[PDB]
Each structure stands twice: as C-alpha cells, then as structure tokens.
Amino acid sequence: PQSDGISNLHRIALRFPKEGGGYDMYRFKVNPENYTIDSPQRTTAIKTKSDIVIEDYGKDIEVINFTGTTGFRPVREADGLKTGKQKMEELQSRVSEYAMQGGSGNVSGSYLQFFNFTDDSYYKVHLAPQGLKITRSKDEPLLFRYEITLVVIGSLTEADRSAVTTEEFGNVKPNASQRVDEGIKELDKNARKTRDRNNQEISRRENTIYNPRQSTNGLKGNIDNMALIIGYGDGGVS
C-alpha cells in the first residue's frame, strides 16, 4: 500500500533463518532513500548480410538494490527499546551470521525472503557479490546509512526445488530388478559364467514409474526373475 487513499503503508521487512528452528524477521523503521530493481535479459542480436537474427535463453537474474538509513529517535519494539544504532548493529550481526558461516560450517536456511509491502511484491533473494556496504558521511553525525545489493532466486509463491512432488503414478521401484539382483548374488561361479556366455551368444546374433497397466516399460524386468527362478540355461539369459 501507499499513503494515498488506502491506509498507512507498511514498511519493508526482511526474514532471516533462525538456527534453532522457526524464523526471525527484521522490519525497517525508515523507508529506503533509493530503491532500484534491475531485470535484464540474456539475449544477443547479430545481423547477417540481409537479415537480423534474434536469440534468447530465458530471463536474467533480477537484481534488487536499495539504500536507506535509521532514525536517531527511539521507537517501540516487540521486545525492549532499540534505537537506530542498535537496529543497525543487529542488522550487521544478522548479515554476518548469514554470510560469515555460509560457506563455512552450516546455515539452516537456504535463502532469504524479501518482502515489499509498499510495492506489493515478494521474492526470494541471496546476498549479491557486491554485498552489504555501510558508511557514515560528514553530514551524518548520528545517522547510519546502509547499502545492500541482492539477487532474486525466484518468486516466493513457488515451492522449493527439493520440496517438489512428481506425478509418480504406479510403482516407482522396479522390484523385479531388485529380486533379480538378489537371486543372482547367490549363484555360483559356473552359473554366472554360463549366464555371461549366453548373454554373449544372444548379443552377437541380434540383428537379422513402473506400472503393468497402461504401460510396457517394465517388460523384461519380470522376465528376468521368471527366467532365473525357473532356469533358462544354467544361469539365465538377459
């Protein structure tokens, strides 16, 4: 939302992963001075003698960059009374926790959730190569300025890649191959040798989601167990 017509706008918030389960968040008391969103495209155009060729390979990384500050005066908090300096220090500590032990040790969270209530947009983000940048200028005796660049992993609405479920209709495990392998392990050396010889004999004169219903993928798997248990040769075929 915004200040026109609709009720008072909600400030931008950041969500970080808590080590001991759950989540912890961070809401900016002062809106950013600058907010830039870059959405480039990975497409190249090259012209031939008498035509233009255009090729594209999908969307590019949506880079998010914004700059803001912290008010000097205090304000109510969920717990305690934190001023601007304490808020900025906590932000630095959280960013260091996400970054310093990212490549080393382990971090429970795989991404950061970036909420834009003012702009009504949501993304999953990671720290950009530029990273956080903190500075205090001549005309800021007490204020603190923060500059951060981010790269969007993807839309927050979509689920995680690892938490995706496929169709998986019918049996997924080919149990026939499993019991064929189990039975073959008990075979003797001569049986395996004869199996190899039979496979070579068949091989050299060739050219001249498991579900039995509505499919034929698992055909030879069932035959292998039946051939082994019944016995087509000393060891079997195929």
Binding site: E168, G170, Q178, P212
Partner: protein, 208 residues
C-alpha cells in the same frame, strides 16, 4: 534371510496394483501408501526382532541347556528401608529418580529409584528398591551406607539398606565360557594318553 523396507514396500505395491484396477495413485501422503509403509516398517521391526533373538540363541541358548549360565551385567539393586519421625497423616509422593547418596567418605556410590512409590497415611515404615547409577561391582556396598536421601523431606528420619548389594555382575566375554565348556567336554574322554595323564593330577602329591 531378512528383508528390507523397500524390498517389502515395492512388493506390496506391485501386489496391490496386480490384484485390483481401482487404485493407480501412489504419491506421498496417500492413505494406501501410508498404510503400506507402516505395515512394511512393522514387518521390518519383526524381522530385526527375529534376527536379534536368533543371535542370542546362537550365543547362549545352545550351550545353556547343560545347566551353565552366562554372567550378564546388571545394575546393583536391593531393598532399602525408610523411617519417619512420626506416623504419616497424608499420602506421600515419591516420584522415580529420587537420588540417593552415601555420607561415608570411603563410599562415593549413588543409587536411584526406577519407578514411583507411595506411602499410605496409615503406614509408618516403607521398603523401596533402589538401583545403582553405575553398572558392575561399583554398585556393591555394605549394609548401612546410604544414610541420606536427596529429596530433603522433613518427614523422613533415616534411610538404610538392610542387605548388601551383590547383583552387580561383571562383564565376561564368551571366549572364556567357550574355553571352559570345551575343557569340560575334553575331560570326559576315556582311554586316552592325555585323559589318563589328566586323571592322575587329581591327587595333590602327583605332580611330575
């Protein structure tokens, strides 16, 4: 010999598909899939129970028929009596885990209760069993060594174990048991040079 979770679940799903045409979905969270997974897990538990029981039988059962019993490490335990200053007026609560300590400087042993106990209002003397916090012979202690209770209740006057604890058996590997069983078996041989030589050693004076 023994099956696995996948080996059972996949066969169950295959039989389910083969028997009926009314079911085709086997995604995660399905009621049928959940039931099959639970059945497979319980069957695997039964398989592991059978395997452990067979291992115990191999280790001990075949030889135990000859009256020989193996020594098993266990917590030291025994009866402990508690005396009150006056007869009780209300039912008292003694939850499990009540720590016991010995005031004697030479006995750092400690004991605790495994299960809850209660003293009736009419009762005035209660006997409660305790178990040592450590295994082996470390839990053994002579009579009248505890002399204290960690609960700090004002009603309790004194505490003492009436009998010494001696059930803290040590841990003995099966190698010694097998060796002694084999030695017993070999001693029964008759009409042999080694057996005859062994039979002469019973007399104390027969050495060389």
């Amino acid at each position: 010999k023994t099956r696995k979770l996948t080996n059972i679940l996949s066969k169950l799903i295959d039989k389910t598909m083969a028997g009926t045409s009314k079911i085709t979905d086997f995604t995660p969270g399905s009621a049928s899939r959940s039931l099959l997974e639970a059945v497979s897990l319980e069957i695997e538990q039964f398989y592991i129970l059978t395997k452990e029981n067979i291992d115990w039988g191999i280790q001990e059962g075949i030889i135990e028929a000859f009256d020989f019993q193996k020594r098993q490490s266990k917590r030291a335990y025994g009866d402990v009596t508690i005396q009150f200053y006056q007869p009780l007026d209300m039912r008292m609560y003694i939850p499990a885990g009540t720590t016991f300590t010995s005031t004697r400087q030479e006995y750092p042993q400690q004991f605790e209760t495994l299960v809850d106990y209660y003293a009736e209002p009419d009762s005035t003397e209660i006997v409660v069993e305790v178990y040592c916090k450590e295994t082996g012979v470390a839990g053994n202690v002579p009579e009248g060594t505890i002399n204290t209770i960690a609960s700090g209740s004002s009603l309790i006057r004194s505490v003492n174990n009436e009998y010494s604890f001696n059930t803290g058996t040590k841990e003995e590997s099966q190698e010694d048991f097998k060796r002694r069983f084999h030695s017993f078996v070999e001693s029964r041989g008759r009409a042999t040079n080694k057996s005859v030589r062994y039979g002469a050693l019973q007399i104390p004076d027969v050495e060389g």
